[PDB]
A paper describes a structure:
Ag43 possesses a modular domain organisation that is common throughout the ATs, which encompasses an N-terminal signal sequence that directs the secretion of the protein across the inner membrane, a passenger (α) domain that is responsible for the function of the protein, and a C-terminal translocator (β) domain that facilitates the translocation of the functional α-domain to the cell surface. After translocation, the Ag43 α-domain (α43) is cleaved but remains attached to the cell via non-covalent interactions. Similar to α43a 13, the α-domain of all three Ag43 variants folds into an L-shaped right-handed three-stranded β-helix, with each turn of the β-spine comprising three β-strands linked by loop regions.
Generation of crystallographically related molecules of α43_UTI89 (i.e. symmetrically related molecules in the crystal lattice) revealed a head-to-tail dimer repeated along the crystal, which resembled the α43a–α43a functional dimer. However, while α43a trans-dimers are stabilised by two interfaces consisting of a total of 18 hydrogen bonds and two salt bridges, α43_UTI89 dimers are formed via interactions from a single interface comprising 13 hydrogen bonds. To test if this α43_UTI89 crystallographic interface was indeed involved in mediating bacterial aggregation, we constructed a mutant with seven amino acid substitutions (Ag43UTI89-mt: T32G, N60G, D79G, T80G, T98G, N100G, N137G; mutations to glycine were adopted as glycine residues are enriched in the loop regions of Ag43 β-helices; Supplementary Fig. 2). Conversely, the reduced aggregation phenotype of Ag43UTI89 is a direct result of the weaker α43_UTI89 dimers, which are only stabilised by a single interface encompassing 13 hydrogen bonds. It appears that the inability of α43_UTI89 to form a double interface may be due to the presence of long sidechains on residues such as R161 or D133 in the F2–F3 loops mapping in the lower part of the β-helix, which in a head-to-tail association via a double interface would result in steric clashes between interacting proteins, although we cannot rule out other amino acids that might also interfere with this interaction.
Numbering used by the authors: 2 to 434, 452 to 561
């Protein structure tokens, strides 16, 4: 009928048209399709199923427009709630599936086993508790998307939450999440307190004024401490990542072997790593270890001491920053420019960058490492390996042995003079970041490397140039030319042609020192590469 009295059970039935069911006994298998037609929090709403103290409902279905209300001492199990349906909970609910529906847990209510799908929403108010929730919605679009009132919003207490792909738990400023696992594609944003989070691929964002305690960051998990956030007792395991932004704090960190730290000297990070204790405080970094994935930014006016950059780690030093007693393990990335001050050891030996004098010596740039030589600066005895980049601004200089392995890059942004030997297995390129430039070197040892040069075939006989100053060009160097003129305009060369390699002051070049890596053509002309008796190399027209 309309009232289910104590000690009485009722089976089946559908509520429509603002009809009411007041449950004092047990109501099994009801379908609730009325009571929410004017949306949540509307006086005009009427009807629904209302579980009283000592009442029970089992296997209730709450369709669009349906309202289930559960008073204190009322109890429901095995509910499912569609889009446009809702359950208001001060009693206890066990196993509620929200397929678009909403569950409001009021002060004193306990929601256990709620499954949040398809842009449903569990709202855990102050004084309320959620337990064993499964979140499958709310993070759609990714961490920078905002889906509002979807997923789980925690103003009270959330316990033993599972955040799956596309799931989002928002811990409001007064809320508390006490045991949480986050999988890949899910995230937990913390304005309040997060306790015992495990990030098994998932992300945790600690916002300003939020705190996270005893976070375990496993493979592919990402804990981000934003400005004014606090992490305490984070453990970063293999392939996990702790990032502490400027003005963020993380204390009692434990970085295992393989656990990345991503921070700067503007942040506060204290803990231990594979070598012992470390600190990042007051613009100073002591003892930092950068695992595979890790990065330490030493900002201008800041300093780091006793840093180990291990395979896959990154030390980045701004102009005016200082990093001493640096150990670059093979594979470690060093990012700096002539303005920085760095000293330590890498795989090939001792290295240093003097920011005042503008001189670098013994650099090893690999695996994302990179160095820029500014005007009036010098890089001496640089080794550029796989995924390393050496960039020279106009007015920057090279000396000693500049060695480019395969997969290495040197970018020349103006005229550049090497007072030593360039040993090139990699790619050298002339660039502007059209005015041609000169690469002058004392000796060039070609090991199958390539030099990317520009040329204009429109009659101006202009191109980039290589100058051998008194030594020799030996081995094998490929020259890759790009016509930066019109592609159908070819003007014949004159005399010896366009001098692309100039041997001067007695320099020689071996007979096979250079060869075009691909044809060079414009208009009616093919342009061949030719060595002449003056040891110089020329582009000349034919056809």
């Amino acid at each position: 009928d309309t009232v289910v009295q104590a000690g009485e059970t009722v089976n089946g039935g559908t509520l429509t048209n603002h009809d009411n069911q007041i449950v004092l006994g047990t109501a099994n298998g009801m379908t609730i399709s009325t009571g929410l037609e004017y949306g949540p929090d509307n006086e005009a709403n009427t009807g629904g199923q209302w579980i009283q103290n000592g009442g029970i409902a089992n296997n209730t279905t709450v369709t669009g427009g349906g309202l289930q209300r559960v008073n204190a001492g009322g109890s429901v199990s095995d509910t499912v709630i569609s889009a446009g349906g809702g359950q208001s909970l001060q009693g206890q609910a066990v196993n509620t599936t929200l397929n678009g529906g909403e569950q409001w847990v009021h002060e004193g209510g306990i929601a256990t086993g709620t499954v949040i799908n398809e842009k449903g929403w569990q709202a855990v108010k102050s004084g309320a508790m959620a337990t064993d929730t499964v979140v499958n919605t709310g993070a759609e679009g990714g961490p920078d998307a905002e889906n509002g009132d979807t997923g789980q919003t925690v103003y009270g207490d959330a316990v033993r939450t599972t955040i799956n792909k596309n799931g989002r738990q928002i811990v409001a400023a007064e809320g508390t999440a006490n045991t949480t696992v986050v999988y890949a594609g899910g995230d937990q944003t913390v304005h309040g307190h997060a306790l015992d989070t495990t990030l098994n691929g998932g992300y945790q964002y600690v916002h300003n004024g939020g705190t996270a305690s005893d976070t375990v960051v496993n493979s592919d998990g990402w804990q981000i401490i934003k400005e004014g956030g606090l992490a305490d007792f984070t453990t970063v395991n293999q392939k996990g990542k702790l990032q502490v932004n400027a003005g963020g704090t993380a204390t009692n960190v434990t970085l295992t072997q393989g656990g990345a730290l991503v921070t700067s000297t503007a942040a506060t990070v204290t803990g231990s790593n594979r070598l012992g204790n470390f600190t990042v405080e007051n613009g100073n970094a002591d003892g930092v270890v950068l695992e595979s994935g890790g990065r330490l930014d030493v900002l201008e006016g800041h300093s780091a001491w006793k840093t180990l950059v291990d395979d896959g780690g990154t030390l980045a030093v701004s102009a005016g920053g200082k990093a001493t007693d640096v150990t670059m393990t093979s594979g470690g990335a060093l990012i700096a420019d002539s303005g920085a001050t760095v000293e330590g050891t890498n795989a090939s030996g001792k290295f240093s960058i003097d920011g005042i004098s503008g001189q670098a010596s013994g650099l090893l740039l690999e695996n994302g490492g990179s160095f820029t030589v500014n005007a009036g600066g010098l890089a001496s005895n640089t080794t550029v390996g796989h995924r390393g980049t050496l960039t020279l601004a106009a007015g920057g200089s090279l000396s000693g042995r500049t060695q480019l392995s395969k997969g290495a890059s040197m970018v020349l942004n103006g005229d550049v003079v090497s007072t030593g030997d360039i040993v090139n297995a990699g790619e050298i390129r002339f660039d502007n970041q059209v005015t041609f430039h000169k690469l002058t070197t004392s000796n060039l040892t070609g090991q199958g490397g390539t030099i990317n040069m520009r040329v204009r075939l429109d009659g101006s006989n202009a191109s980039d140039q290589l100058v051998i100053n008194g030594g020799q060009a030996t081995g094998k160097t490929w020259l890759a030319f790009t016509n930066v003129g019109n592609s159908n305009l070819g003007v014949a060369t004159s005399g010896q042609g366009i001098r692309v390699v100039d041997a001067q002051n007695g320099a020689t070049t071996e007979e096979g020192a250079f060869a075009l890596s691909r044809p060079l053509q414009a208009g009616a002309f093919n342009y061949t590469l030719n060595r002449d008796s003056d040891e110089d190399w020329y582009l000349r027209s034919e056809n």
